[PDB]
Design a protein around this ligand. Structure first.
Ligand code: HEM
Ligand code: HEM
Lengths: 137, 137
């Protein structure tokens, strides 16, 4: 279920973080406007940039924190507010996050593993709702 | 305290993992008999060897989960059993683990941050006792 999935992801977080983030960027190419340093690069090129693996793991570490602190796949309002207030997230809207979670759930469903994709889908929807309540447009 | 330290480490885990593991190898050079691929290499060389980074990060990914699952710095018996039974740990003894945690605690005390080094010292001792209970020599 959801708790085991957090453990699975954490066990090899670098690898999962990179592959889910690339799946997102390739599914929604316009989203790369937010990451101008990644423009014009294939997946293997990105993985050769030190900050790509580093920053992307750090993203997924925070995601796993928020997931683990959730109750029934509903994130804490305070965690949603952190995500809204981060300077690096200024100007994002909830649709950016919606798309990330669509890509994450699609990745899980295609992985041939045993992820609880339905829980992750709910978590993404509930995170979007929480971000809106915490003041994201 | 201990829970926050898990979060701190997880926020920059590959860097902490490599730096703590290097501190261990450099404090206890004979321990490199277990890691013959790492012989004859400076720290910077090891940090550009793919398996050194990838394996050491996976070690710390799991270590943080064992720490997170602990109660008052005492690990789950199931986690101790996993660490004893894993094929990669065959022929280790508890002294290997003792030394790793001595180095980790020393690293924390020298870091100039606010780690709860006493809790990590307890965790290392309690993990060793759990490994012995689970059948490690
Ligand atoms: C739950 C989802 C998300 C989490 C947990 C998250 C977390 C983070 C974290 C921890 C950082 C700092 C990384 C570092 O520099 O070490 C960061 C930076 C950033 N985030 Fe997010 N983020 C999320 C979703 C998004 C989405 C959906 C977008 C845009 C599509 C976005 C855009 C950015 C940008 C532009 C930066 C700064 C540039 C960069 O690090 O490459 N984030 N995010
Ligand atoms: C709580 C402490 C420890 C944890 C969580 C841990 C975890 C792991 C993990 C996850 C692996 C697989 C790494 C991979 O190949 O991707 C591994 C491998 C290994 N471990 Fe440990 N380990 C610990 C302590 C030790 C100690 C103290 C030693 C010896 C001093 C040791 C020796 C080895 C060896 C020789 C391998 C095989 C080489 C490798 O796969 O990296 N481990 N350990």
């Amino acid at each position: 279920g959801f708790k085991q999935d957090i453990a699975t992801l954490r066990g090899d977080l670098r690898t999962y973080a990179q592959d889910i983030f690339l799946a997102f960027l390739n599914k929604y190419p316009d989203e790369k406007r937010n990451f101008k340093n990644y423009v014009g690069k294939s997946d293997q090129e990105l993985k050769s940039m030190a900050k790509f693996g580093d920053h992307t793991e750090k993203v997924f570490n925070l995601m796993m924190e928020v997931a683990d602190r959730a109750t029934d796949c509903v994130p804490l309002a305070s965690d949603a507010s952190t995500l809204v207030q981060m300077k690096q997230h200024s100007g994002l809207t909830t649709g950016n996050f919606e798309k990330l979670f669509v890509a994450l759930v699609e990745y899980m469903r295609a992985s041939g593993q045993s992820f609880d994709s339905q829980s992750w889908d709910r978590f993404g929807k509930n995170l979007v709702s929480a971000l809106s309540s915490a003041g994201m447009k």
